[PDB]
Design a binder for this molecule. Structure first.
Ligand SMILES: [Ca+2]
Ligand SMILES: [Ca+2]
Ligand SMILES: [Ca+2]
Ligand SMILES: [Ca+2]
Lengths: 104, 104
C-alpha cells in the first residue's frame, strides 16, 4: 500500500531517492508485470556464470549503478520498481515500497 | 500523499479508491505520458458547462462507470492516472495524487 512518486529527467541517469528509512537496509527488485503472483527479480546482485534456463539481462543499461542505486529515468516495462526495506540485515521483518516516476 | 497504490484483478472492473479525504472535492485526469510538461485530460465530465469546458470520452473500455469512478483494471497507456483533491469547489488550493495499480 506504500508508494513513492519521484520526478526525473527522462532518458538520463537518475540517482533514486531510496524511500526506506536512512538507517534501514534496502534491496531493489522488479516485480514482473507488477503482478503479485509474478517473480520478484532482484536487481543489484548479479553474479556471472549462471546456467539457469531463465536469465535476466540489461540491454539498455536500465540499472546504471548499484552504489548508490542509479537507473536510467524511464518508464518501467518488465514490471514495477520495488524496494524492500528492513531494520534488520537479515530482513526478518520488512516492507516493500513501489517507486513511480513522473517525467520532468 | 503524492502516490496511491491500489490492487485489483487485471481486466476486471474495479471501483477506484478515491485517495482524497472524504469531504474533499476531487477530479480525475490522465496526465499524458506521465510528463509534468504535458496536459491533464479530465475524465468523467458529466456535461460541458461552467465547471467543465471540455468533455473527454474514451473510445475503448478503460472507463466502466463514472458514478462511482470504475475502471477496467489496467494501467492506462495514454498517461498516468491522477486525482486532483481540493477542499474548495473552485480548485484554487489543491494537491494531486497519482494512482498506480498492483495486479492480483
Ligand atoms: Ca530517502
Ligand atoms: Ca538507504
Ligand atoms: Ca478512500
Ligand atoms: Ca472523495
Amino acid at each position: 500500500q506504500e508508494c513513492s512518486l519521484q520526478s526525473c529527467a527522462q532518458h538520463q541517469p537518475y540517482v533514486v531517492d531510496d524511500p526506506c528509512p536512512i538507517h534501514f537496509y534496502s534491496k531493489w527488485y522488479i516485480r514482473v508485470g507488477a503482478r503479485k503472483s509474478a517473480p520478484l527479480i532482484e536487481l543489484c546482485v548479479d553474479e556471472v556464470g549462471s546456467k539457469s534456463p531463465i536469465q535476466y539481462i540489461d540491454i539498455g543499461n536500465y540499472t546504471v549503478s548499484c552504489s548508490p542505486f542509479t537507473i536510467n529515468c524511464q518508464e518501467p516495462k518488465l514490471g514495477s520498481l520495488v524496494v524492500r526495506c528492513s531494520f534488520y540485515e537479515d530482513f526478518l521483518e520488512y516492507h516493500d515500497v513501489r517507486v513511480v516516476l513522473d517525467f520532468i
